């Protein structure tokens, strides 16, 4: 959380899907219906710069895409991810037309 250390080896982290409450209360007026928070409010565990665009897989399903947050692993500042379950139709249509 303090510095710049980019690994050569793929890193892993298991985190839970946080409720809407914890997500919206962490970023007032900044969370839309296409975002979900996954992480720990106590900070210390989180995705960071470089992990962007990466996968958040839950129960064998891609539920999130590393998107944004305020810094990395700061307390009460969990990462926010694109809510993939709203984009299946878009993904399908796009793949079929290209």
């Amino acid at each position: 959380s303090s510095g710049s250390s980019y690994p050569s080896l793929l890193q892993c982290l298991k985190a839970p899907v946080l409720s809407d409450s914890s997500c919206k209360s962490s970023y007032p007026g900044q969370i839309t219906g296409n975002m979900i928070c996954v992480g720990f409010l106590e900070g210390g565990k989180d995705s960071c710069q470089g992990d962007s665009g990466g996968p958040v897989v839950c129960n064998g399903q891609l539920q999130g895409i590393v998107s944004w947050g305020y810094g990395c692993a700061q307390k009460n500042k969990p990462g926010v991810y694109t809510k993939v379950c709203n984009y299946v139709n878009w993904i399908q249509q796009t793949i079929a037309a290209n």
């Binding site: 959380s1 510095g3 710049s4 250390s5 980019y6 690994p7 050569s8 080896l9 793929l10 890193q11 892993c12 982290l13 298991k14 985190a15 839970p16 899907v17 409720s19 809407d20 900044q30 839309t32 296409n34 975002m35 996954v38 565990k45 989180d46 995705s47 960071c48 470089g50 992990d51 962007s52 665009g53 990466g54 996968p55 958040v56 897989v57 839950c58 129960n59 064998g60 399903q61 891609l62 539920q63 999130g64 895409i65 590393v66 998107s67 944004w68 990395c72 926010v80 694109t82 809510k83 993939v84 379950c85 709203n86 984009y87 299946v88 878009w90 993904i91 796009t94 793949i95 290209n98």
Partner: protein, 125 residues
């Protein structure tokens, strides 16, 4: 990833590295020809690296394929980051095996408290 652990080699087969000289973002293989990532990771030139573990050393399981098409969500908002999703079509199909596999799209949204697995080569500090 901060406060994480080193994934077992190739235990995340759907994980890809977007490269343009060097790794800049992650991605997920959901189809033999398509990778999904974030729109804010957009670059006009992108090489997709599959079957990666140690992005600094050829291990012999990698498949380096250039992006043929890059499609960012039309409603992507750079200010709010709403619709931060992007699709990448590979110029040639990725060969699926034990080290390179697709990840399923959600059959439904996840309930709160659902444990998930996050991966990547981003900043660890």
């Amino acid at each position: 990833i901060v406060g994480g652990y080193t994934c077992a080699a190739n235990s995340i087969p759907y994980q890809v590295s977007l490269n343009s000289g060097s790794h800049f973002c992650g991605g997920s293989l959901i189809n033999s020809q398509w990778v999904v990532s974030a729109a804010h990771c957009y670059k006009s030139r992108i090489q997709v690296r599959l079957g990666e573990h140690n992005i600094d050393v050829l291990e012999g399981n990698e498949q380096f394929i250039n992006a043929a098409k890059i499609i960012t969500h039309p409603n992507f908002n750079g200010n709010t980051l709403d619709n931060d999703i992007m699709l990448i079509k590979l110029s040639s199909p990725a060969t699926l095996n034990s080290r390179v596999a697709t990840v399923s799209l959600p059959r439904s949204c996840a309930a709160a408290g659902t444990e998930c697995l996050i991966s990547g080569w981003g900043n660890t500090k």
